Design a protein around this ligand. Structure first.
Ligand SMILES: Nc1ncnc2c1ncn2[C@@H]1O[C@H](COP(=O)(O)OP(=O)(O)NP(=O)(O)O)[C@@H](O)[C@H]1O
Ligand SMILES: [Mg+2]
Length: 1141
DNA sequence: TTTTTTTTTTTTTCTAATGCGAGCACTGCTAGCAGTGCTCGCATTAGATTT
């Protein structure tokens, strides 16, 4: 191992950089990034300078990714500024500038990089896999559009239930008994193998044969038990004489007990072998049991039956391993198949699919696709690495030239074993890499904390109990030498262990006492910092200890809740950063549901009363009592809820809840009440979720259905449903040890560091092959091999949790006993991670623990006994509130301007079906119809196929169309067939501006003056409108240099042709107010012609208006169906002037 | 193709480990009996993580 200098580090091949915590592993990423962008280092430099898009960086968490991206951006900016100024105030940038040959070109490259920083290739492992799969779906063999699912619990449980149905159902009742004894159902079966299903499959030690079915194992075990029973049956009488004759202590083996045991074993042997249960007395008659208890130098009773019983009881009889193996294969297969069917994908599935692709035949090509894309890749937090990830990284970047690979990690921090990560693969990689580099100095914390840690981990030799993980002392940097933490004028020791009092302490008592002590100490720190006494000082500078800089690191959820409850008992604000609880699980969700349910149907008194009596409203009991008696108050409430329903129907969801909160003053009363701030935040969050979900759901009742559904089954994994932060003020941050990786905290607490657990399951790694091995049998060898790794993981977790703090870290210590009996004897602290380092891995009593603590204590490490904290709430000095006033609006905004059409302002062929779609189809027919050619039957048949009407109309409709085309027109006698494509314009769209507001009264008067149809009808009624007017003219055509306007109408006036006469057509025009319609159309056409036609005249060039009633068109009567009307020129001129100004 | 009624609640783990109490065989002390060492059985209590 060599000391590391970022400028001199060569970037070629594989390089491993390992160092202790807070030594600047992450900080070196930025320096290496800058070196890569500029291509600095000469011999140690990359052969060619690279771009932002060609550097890969892989981090463990998303937050770390964002942090690193931002910091790289900042560093690029600062280095560019330095290159432009040729001077800088930082030593790293100064050395870089000394190394740079040309500074102008360097600044140019840095500028390009800064501009491309949006495309920085900084991902996590799962994001990198997903992105490489999507960018190379062709080589990998995936689909081009893949979906992402975060939670596979439902698919997994469904596959397990399918396995159960297929296998456990057909079984006979006798094998079914044995299966039912082990697992009650698929729910319990999934619980055992849930961990093994996730990630790579575990090698099973001593797997059953492939052809062995359940019935074969059952028959084998039944045969063994039958043999033992028969051997007992044959020797049921000789054993008494054998035991009596031979010499064995009868104090250990009483004659009455012997007779009882013989009777029980005989009764069991005569019993039919229905189940695998064996009596306990067989343990007494084992050869080893007899050999253990016998006279010194005396005859020992020995019989072949005893040897048979000893061989039988040596290993448990069960079908567990076979069923577990079959399920572990079949459920995984089924899940993969279903996910392939739906075209979905998951994180573990992403990694496994990329690995499979690289391992397949085409993967070689895929390898180049990833290798050419990312020449250099830097993996951070490499200690947490799965075998899949290392296989991928090796396959891609092992031996190819012109491609570097930088592995940065600390094995002492490998704490994600539970998540599939492995330390043994890290050590494999460490063996496979030749070069090693190290960081010497700690830049994170005060020199006190560094010395404390160095002293605590130097107690024993090979503290981390792995030969490949040697511990060495680290040295603090010169910048932090001044750091101190002063409490009440006295400098506190860097690390303080709070020892609990007593000999034997239970787990629950330990948790309660330490939670209380931590709460009391945090309260004292806050009280002393509020008066400016307690200060975190860097030399002369200082600052008080806010409730934010204090962090409490916990291992489990229940632990964090135990901390938070006691911490809130002292009225101290705190928040738990690892909280995955869902909002809908709170009571506010239920209250909001009751409120919506009452608003929906205020008629029902029960639902309304239930919604009123919620804590959210804040009514008392006397309020509800008086309100259940007075009818007027109840009626007023019903009325306001009915109005809320109207608001809810019209404006949506959030407006209704907002009006309710305003009228009932819910927000003010909640903020006034103690604790109501969290309540109001949850209410607002639920309101936002309800609005988001009500946008998509069109029905109002569907939203209540959706809310009840979500309340019934809250999804904790959902990100949107995560509970928001209570307040933006200072909060004590409770964070788990795993989530605290790579972070930093001024003051740190570890209330329950001593607490541990013993691993019962047998899952370990072979010391030779370094492969994950699951032993479905409970052989104690496997259990010991697993417990050793558990202890190593606990030691690494302890190291991680200790290296977080900067100024001060406290931690609880107690003589924790995990065994009920022999509490007076040795404690179980030695098994705990911290205890093993305090007692040098030697079991001791409480006095021994206290003496070891006292011996360990020095200037940096001080111990104090833990006592019950004083129950006094933290007092916070309130602050006066200044005068507050909201602004008001002097000028109201105007909605006068708008764009409207005629519809907004207004607001056998005879037996043919009618409607909106039939009318649109009839119009679309003429839209693309050629008038100069006869109708084609195939075209009409195709249009009837499109519309879906009966083909029976096809012979008739064609004829009807010709009746339209050949029908004559106004006295000029124009036939629609006579119109060439040059003299026609179909569906012309027009825009007509209306500058002054259009008043219905000021127009209706003129229209009545110049048109009798308006005089017959009542006055026009519509609101003032200023803006534009849109419209679509059906047809415009010119004949004999005279223009016309044609409008199609398919309204079914009547059943007979008499309803299509002149008077009836005029009546229909007056009824549907087509008068104003054609008047506006004429104004539009007049303006368009005046614009386009040079030397235009209304009387000369205009020809009138023609309404064509399709169904009215009949060959028998020329007048029926067509209507012709010419607006007065004076009306047109006055209307134009009105609309113009 | 016509129509009437009615309002309330119920459940909750399991395994394991020990402490004591009762019974008994052995055995040493002054043939029986008290101590002792032991052992089985019933009741009581503790604990069950982490992206
Ligand atoms: N060369 C340096 N000069 C100045 N400060 C540094 C230097 N290297 C690291 N630091 C500071 O040291 C602190 C922690 O460094 P960091 O890069 O997080 O190391 P680390 O290996 O990531 N710690 P961890 O993530 O827990 O393993 C930060 O405040 C950095 O600014
Ligand atoms: Mg880091």
């Amino acid at each position: 191992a060599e000391t590391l200098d970022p400028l001199r580090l060569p970037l070629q091949g594989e390089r491993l950089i390992e160092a202790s915590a807070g030594t600047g592993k992450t900080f070196t990423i930025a320096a290496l990034y800058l070196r890569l962008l500029l291509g600095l280092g000469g011999s140690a430099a990359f052969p060619r300078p690279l771009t932002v898009e060609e550097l890969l960086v892989v981090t463990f968490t998303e937050a770390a990714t964002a942090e690193l991206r931002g910091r790289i951006r900042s560093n690029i900016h600062e280095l560019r500024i330095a290159c432009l100024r040729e001077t800088t105030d930082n030593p790293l940038y100064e050395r870089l500038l000394e190394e740079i040959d040309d500074k102008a070109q360097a600044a140019q490259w840095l500028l390009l990089a800064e501009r491309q920083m949006d495309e920085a290739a900084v991902f996590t492992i799962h994001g990198f896999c997903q992105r490489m799969l999507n960018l190379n779906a062709f080589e990998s063999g995936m689909l081009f559009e893949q979906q992402l699912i975060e939670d596979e619990s439902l698919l997994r449980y469904q596959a397990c239930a399918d396995f159960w149905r297929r296998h456990c159902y057909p079984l006979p009742r006798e094998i079914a008994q044995v299966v039912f004894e082990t697992w009650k159902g698929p729910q319990a079966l999934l619980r055992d193998i849930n961990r093994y299903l996730q990630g790579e499959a575990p090698v099973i030690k001593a797997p059953p044969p492939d052809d062995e079915t359940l019935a074969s194992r059952h028959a084998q075990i039944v045969a063994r038990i039958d043999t033992v029973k028969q051997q007992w049956r044959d020797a049921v009488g000789e054993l008494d004489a054998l035991i009596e004759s031979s010499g064995i202590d009868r104090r250990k083996f009483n004659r009455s007990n012997q007779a009882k045991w013989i009777d029980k074993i005989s009764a069991w042997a005569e019993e039919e072998t229905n189940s695998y249960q064996l009596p306990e007395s067989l343990e007494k008659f084992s050869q080893r049991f007899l050999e253990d208890r016998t006279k010194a130098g005396g005859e020992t009773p020995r019989h072949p039956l005893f040897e048979a019983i000893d061989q039988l009881l040596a290993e448990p009889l069960s079908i567990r391993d076979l069923v577990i193996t079959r399920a572990l294969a079949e459920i995984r297969e089924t899940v993969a198949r279903e996910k392939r069917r739906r075209g979905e994908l998951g994180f573990d599935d992403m990694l496994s699919r990329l690995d499979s692709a690289l391992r397949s035949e085409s993967g070689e090509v895929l390898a180049a696709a990833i290798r050419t894309r990312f020449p250099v890749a830097m993996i951070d937090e490499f200690q947490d690495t799965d075998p899949q990830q290392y296989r991928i990284f090796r396959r891609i970047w092992h031996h190819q030239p012109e491609t570097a690979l930088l592995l940065i990690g600390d094995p002492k921090q490998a704490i994600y074993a539970f998540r599939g990560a492995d330390i043994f693969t890290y050590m494999k990689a460490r063996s496979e890499v030749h070069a090693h580099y190290t960081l010497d100095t700690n830049w994170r914390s005060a020199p006190g904390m560094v010395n404390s840690v160095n002293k605590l981990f130097s107690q024993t030799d090979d503290a981390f109990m792995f030969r490949e993980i040697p511990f060495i002392p680290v040295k603090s940097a010169g910048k932090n030498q001044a750091l101190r933490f002063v409490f009440k004028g006295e400098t506190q020791p860097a690390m303080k262990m709070w020892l609990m009092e007593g000999e034997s302490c239970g787990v629950g008592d330990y948790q309660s006492t330490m939670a209380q002590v931590c709460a009391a100490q945090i309260r004292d720190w806050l009280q002393a910092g509020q008066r400016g006494e307690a200060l975190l000082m860097n030399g002369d500078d200082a600052r008080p200890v806010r409730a934010s800089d204090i962090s409490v690191l916990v291992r489990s959820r229940q632990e964090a809740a135990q901390v938070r409850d006691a911490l809130t008992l002292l009225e101290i604000p705190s928040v738990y950063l690892s909280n995955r609880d869902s909002v809908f699980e709170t009571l506010e969700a239920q209250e909001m549901l009751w409120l919506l349910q009452a608003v929906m149907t205020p008629e029902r008194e029960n639902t309304l009363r239930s919604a009123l009596a919620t804590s959210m409203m804040g009514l008392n009991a006397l309020d509800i009592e008086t309100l259940n008696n007075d009818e007027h108050a109840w009626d007023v409430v019903v009325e306001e809820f009915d109005g809320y329903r109207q608001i809810w129907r019209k404006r949506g969801v959030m407006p209704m809840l907002r009006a309710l909160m305003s009228a009932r003053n819910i927000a003010e009363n909640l903020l006034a009440t103690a604790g109501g701030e969290r309540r109001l935040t949850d209410i607002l969050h639920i309101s936002e979720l309800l609005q988001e979900a009500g946008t998509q759901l069109e029905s109002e009742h569907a939203l209540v259905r959706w809310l009840s559904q979500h309340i019934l089954e809250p999804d904790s994994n959902a990100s949107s449903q995560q509970m928001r932060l209570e307040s933006d003020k200072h909060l004590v941050q409770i964070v788990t040890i795993h989530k605290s990786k790579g972070l930093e905290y001024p003051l740190v607490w570890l209330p329950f560091i001593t607490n541990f657990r013993v691993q019962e399951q047998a899952f370990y790694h072979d010391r030779h092959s370094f492969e994950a091995v699951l032993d479905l049998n409970a052989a104690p060898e496997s259990v010991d091999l697993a417990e050793a790794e558990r202890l190593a993981e606990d030691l690494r977790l302890l190291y991680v949790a200790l290296t977080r703090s900067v100024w001060h870290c406290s931690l609880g210590v107690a003589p924790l006993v995990r065994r009920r009996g022999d509490k007076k004897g040795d404690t179980d602290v030695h098994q705990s991670a911290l205890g093993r380092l305090l007692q040098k891995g030697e079991p001791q009593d409480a006095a021994g623990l206290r003496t070891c603590i006292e011996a360990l204590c020095d200037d940096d490490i001080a111990w104090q006994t833990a006592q019950t904290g004083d129950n006094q709430p933290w007092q916070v000095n309130d602050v006066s509130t200044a005068e507050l006033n909201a602004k008001t609006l002097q000028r109201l905004p105007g909605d006068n301007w708008r764009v409207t059409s005629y519809s907004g302002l207004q607001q056998t062929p005879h037996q043919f079906p009618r409607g909106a779609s039939p009318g649109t189809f009839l119009h679309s027919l003429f839209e693309d119809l050629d008038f100069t050619q006869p109708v084609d039957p195939n075209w009409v048949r195709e249009k009837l196929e499109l519309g879906g009407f009966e083909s029976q109309w096809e012979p008739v409709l064609t004829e009807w169309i010709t009746a339209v085309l050949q029908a004559p027109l106004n006295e000029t006698g124009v036939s629609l067939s006579q119109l060439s494509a040059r003299n026609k314009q179909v569906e012309m769209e027009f825009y007509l501006p209306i500058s002054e507001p259009l008043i219905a009264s000021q127009l209706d008067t003129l229209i009545r003056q110049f048109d009798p149809l308006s005089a017959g009808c009542p006055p026009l009624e519509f609101m003032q409108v200023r803006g534009m007017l849109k419209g679509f003219i059906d047809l415009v055509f010119r004949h004999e240099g005279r223009y016309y306007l044609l409008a199609y109408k398919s309204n079914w006036l009547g059943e007979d042709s008499s309803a299509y006469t002149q008077q009836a057509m005029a009546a229909a025009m007056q009824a549907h107010r087509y008068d104003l319609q054609y008047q506006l159309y004429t104004l539009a056409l007049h303006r368009y012609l005046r614009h386009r036609i040079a030397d235009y005249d209304y009387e000369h060039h205009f020809g009138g208006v023609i309404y064509l009633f399709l169904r009215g068109v009949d060959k028998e009567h020329p007048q029926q169906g067509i209507y012709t009307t010419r607006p007065n020129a004076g009306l047109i001129a006055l209307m134009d002037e009105m609309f113009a100004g």
